[PDB]
Design an enzyme around this catalytic site. Structure first.
Site, PDB file in Angstrom:
ATOM      1  N   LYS A  82      63.149  50.366  37.789  1.00 48.44           N
ATOM      2  CA  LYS A  82      61.747  50.557  37.345  1.00 48.44           C
ATOM      3  C   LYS A  82      60.973  51.564  38.202  1.00 48.44           C
ATOM      4  CE  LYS A  82      61.767  47.431  34.049  1.00 48.44           C
ATOM      5  NZ  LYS A  82      61.650  47.786  32.609  1.00 48.44           N
ATOM      6  N   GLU A 104      51.844  46.428  32.346  1.00 47.03           N
ATOM      7  CA  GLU A 104      52.320  45.110  31.972  1.00 47.03           C
ATOM      8  C   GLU A 104      53.533  44.772  32.805  1.00 47.03           C
ATOM      9  OE1 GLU A 104      55.588  47.485  30.544  1.00 47.03           O
ATOM     10  OE2 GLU A 104      53.418  47.863  30.472  1.00 47.03           O
ATOM     11  N   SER A 371      71.182  47.462  37.174  1.00 48.99           N
ATOM     12  CA  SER A 371      69.770  47.819  37.114  1.00 48.99           C
ATOM     13  C   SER A 371      68.917  47.253  38.243  1.00 48.99           C
ATOM     14  CB  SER A 371      69.179  47.405  35.761  1.00 48.99           C
ATOM     15  OG  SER A 371      69.162  46.003  35.598  1.00 48.99           O
TER      16      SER A 371
HETATM   17  C1  LIG Z   1      66.017  44.415  37.069  1.00 49.03           C
HETATM   18  C2  LIG Z   1      65.771  44.641  35.600  1.00 49.03           C
HETATM   19  N1  LIG Z   1      66.772  45.079  34.802  1.00 49.03           N
HETATM   20  C3  LIG Z   1      66.626  45.308  33.479  1.00 49.03           C
HETATM   21  C4  LIG Z   1      65.413  45.110  32.821  1.00 49.03           C
HETATM   22  C5  LIG Z   1      65.316  45.376  31.324  1.00 49.03           C
HETATM   23  O1  LIG Z   1      64.383  46.417  31.028  1.00 49.03           O
HETATM   24  P1  LIG Z   1      64.889  47.816  30.449  1.00 49.03           P
HETATM   25  O2  LIG Z   1      65.705  47.438  29.236  1.00 49.03           O
HETATM   26  O3  LIG Z   1      63.629  48.571  30.136  1.00 49.03           O
HETATM   27  O4  LIG Z   1      65.710  48.474  31.535  1.00 49.03           O
HETATM   28  C6  LIG Z   1      64.240  44.639  33.593  1.00 49.03           C
HETATM   29  C7  LIG Z   1      62.941  44.432  32.875  1.00 49.03           C
HETATM   30  N2  LIG Z   1      61.823  43.879  33.594  1.00 49.03           N
HETATM   31  C8  LIG Z   1      60.498  44.094  33.033  1.00 49.03           C
HETATM   32  C9  LIG Z   1      60.269  43.285  31.752  1.00 49.03           C
HETATM   33  O5  LIG Z   1      60.159  41.879  31.996  1.00 49.03           O
HETATM   34  C10 LIG Z   1      59.431  43.845  34.052  1.00 49.03           C
HETATM   35  O6  LIG Z   1      58.252  43.734  33.657  1.00 49.03           O
HETATM   36  O7  LIG Z   1      59.761  43.781  35.259  1.00 49.03           O
HETATM   37  C11 LIG Z   1      64.424  44.397  35.044  1.00 49.03           C
HETATM   38  O8  LIG Z   1      63.399  43.961  35.819  1.00 49.03           O
END
Ligand SMILES: Cc1ncc(COP(=O)(O)O)c(CN[C@@H](CO)C(=O)O)c1O
Ligand SMILES: Cc1ncc(COP(=O)(O)O)c(CN[C@@H](CO)C(=O)O)c1O
Ligand code: NA
Ligand code: NA
Ligand code: NA
Lengths: 384, 382
Positions: A82, A104, A371
């Protein structure tokens, strides 16, 4: 705006202006020398890019089929992919003259990433988070507070991520002159699906160079978990025009696809419009967006980004699902076998790659996008 | 063996053979191309080295003096510098034909790093941890268990880090044929202070190349927190022969140096023999330390720091719980980096020092870990 039939800009007239200004600024700065210099400077020196590509030798030999490599986004500052998007958009917002970021978050990782980027660049940060999600993410909420952000609990609707997005859009309507809405996945109205994918594509570009270094050839399969779809688009996108590279997105199967408690929008959802986009959503018979379930708190978005809807429709990528049980099993397996504690989201991708590798030849190569790290999920794993 | 008068190998005869075996193996492998192939491969692809050197622009402008750079060991796999040493020694152990790692841990970071290294290399891992420490490190104990390690609570003595080390030494004496004692800091009998410093020296080697790239010159000061002293030796060591680089170690001042509730062994301890080494220890009997930072809990300090202090090559200072907690909050809000409470001691001192220096001068602060592990401590304090 469109990825075939999916995407668009399904918003009130009051957001047309702000979205137009954003698209204009993005087109100006995406290829700007100074913007890209600053972005790459922060990604390198603050976020720690490039992340490594790790050959999971012990896991590979245990299964006895294809080679499993892990793209280590778990090592990015903040503990998840992220951050890549948070920095890109926060910097874009700063160059547009904005003073405040809103975002969000469901799991809290995007909230933390936004709070971190906001602190770095000297901007105010308010994070909208469904009251149900605040309750189950005490530590990420604390991280956000320590970073100087305010966490605004959302009590409307189901008190979850879909509701947090709705409140953020309402905020952005009034505050856009000085506020940038920092969307955290490849979702929302155009240009957000495109922007977020562009800021995550660094993952795939690194992974391509790194696999050529390690193996002298492109991989046979790339596997990534899919919530809204940003980590998956980031690793997929630089390989889309390499036709022999299979792309597999892994949705949350929850308690099972037939149980009605999952987050598999592409697998089991229907076409619909929400949050400014035409895509696949888990919806009931009265057109209401349904609550999703997953053991992974970040696979909580009831929809999926339109670029994934499109890649599914043209059959460029395949989308599968893995259950809570399978993801947990993979969480433990990777921890024990390679000494890496993965995020539960990422464990879905690991779980599928393990199944797939067993059916494939020892000559073949799988890259799994890891991720995030699992420190955030320790209580959830304990309870289950 | 010695650093001036400090260090040595003051152990029972049962430990002499094992230590001599370790010395011989280390001499064989330390510059061996094959050993270094495997070590660098794991540090790059698994741990994520090199870590970046970050210019803290907002923090620098706010203070209004020297440029503050942060060596980002918080980004290493596991969240602390401990991983560098855990991998190096676990690989050494593997090549020596050992099947088992034991290790002490106080804060749980060295425990987790050892558990991770052991999982990576297919070696059984037993972590000794004082029952008082087991009790207040719920999550680290759980990370260790998820990684396949057993945590053995220590119920003897004060039930803290010094007692865990005593138990691990008793274990090793019996099991050394197939067990390697993976010490986590630059402490214990020769060859451990040297080995641990050598495996942490990558920090300084990176930081030197990185600051020469960024600023075209060596730094004016390097600042690092000092528990046993490994993260500080790691960043210090490659600069020792660069005469113009000042080296500052920051110990835990706790509730204040006068309160006697601190961990400032160099500032206020006495030279003595304990855990097989001549160094500074807090005390007539060695007592447990206090610090808000769980990782600054060793009552003693590595003999190479005792030496640097004595020849005046490095200056040693102390920062209080209150000052460290302030710096934890400051770095989080100003730069978007949540530091370990240990590392926050160095940040706190660096902020004081930068104020007094000119705008063209350069401080590198070693950010030994990330603060995720300390969130509950900071929640209760704040
Ligand atoms: C470690 C990790 N891997 C994968 C995902 C999936 O999101 P993506 O499909 O946009 O990568 C998230 C999503 N997390 C988002 C949605 O809940 C958040 O607000 O933090 C994550 O935190
Ligand atoms: C992040 C961090 N920074 C610094 C230190 C101090 O140790 P050093 O002086 O050997 O670097 C520690 C010690 N941690 C040891 C001792 O309790 C452990 O067993 O985990 C640490 O965890
Ligand atoms: Na790195
Ligand atoms: Na979904
Ligand atoms: Na001490």
């Amino acid at each position: 705006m469109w990825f075939g039939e999916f995407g668009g800009q399904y918003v009130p007239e009051t957001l047309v202006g702000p979205l137009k200004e954003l698209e204009k600024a993005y087109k100006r700065f995406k290829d700007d020398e100074e913007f890209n210099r600053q972005l790459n400077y922060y990604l390198k020196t603050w976020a720690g890019r490039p992340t490594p590509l790790y050959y999971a030798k012990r896991l590979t030999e245990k299964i006895g089929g294809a080679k499993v490599y892990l793209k280590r986004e778990d090592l990015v500052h903040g503990g998840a992919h992220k951050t890549n998007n948070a920095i890109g958009q926060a910097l874009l917002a700063k160059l547009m003259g904005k003073t405040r970021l809103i975002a969000e978050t469901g799991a809290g990782q995007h909230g933390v990433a936004t709070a971190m980027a906001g602190a770095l660049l000297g901007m105010k940060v308010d994070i909208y988070m469904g009251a149900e999600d605040v309750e189950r993410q005490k530590m990420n909420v604390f991280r956000m507070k320590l970073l100087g952000a305010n966490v605004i609990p959302v009590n409307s609707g189901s008190r979850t991520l879909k509701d947090a997005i709705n409140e953020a859009l309402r905020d952005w309507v009034a505050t856009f002159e000085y506020t940038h809405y920092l969307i955290g996945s490849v979702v929302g109205p155009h240009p957000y699906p495109t922007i977020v994918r562009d800021f995550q594509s660094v993952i795939g570009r690194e992974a391509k160079a790194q696999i050529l270094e390690a193996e002298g050839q492109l991989p046979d399969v790339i596997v990534a978990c899919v919530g809204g779809g940003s980590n998956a688009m980031g690793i997929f996108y630089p390989f889309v025009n390499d036709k022999k590279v299979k792309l597999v997105g892994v949705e949350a199967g929850g308690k099972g696809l037939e149980s009605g408690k999952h987050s598999a929008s592409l697998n089991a959802g229907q076409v619909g419009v929400s949050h400014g986009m035409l895509s696949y959503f888990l919806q009931d018979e009265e057109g209401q967006i349904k609550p999703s379930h997953s053991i992974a708190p970040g696979l909580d978005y009831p929809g999926v980004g339109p670029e994934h809807a499109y890649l599914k429709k043209i059959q460029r990528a395949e989308y599968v699902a893995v259950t809570d049980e399978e993801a947990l099993k993979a969480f433990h397996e990777l921890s024990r076998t390679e000494g890496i504690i993965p995020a539960l989201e990422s464990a879905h991708a690991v779980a599928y790659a393990m199944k797939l590798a067993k059916e494939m030849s020892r000559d073949e190569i799988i890259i799994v996008n890891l991720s995030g790290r699992g420190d955030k999920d320790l209580d959830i794993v304990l309870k289950a």
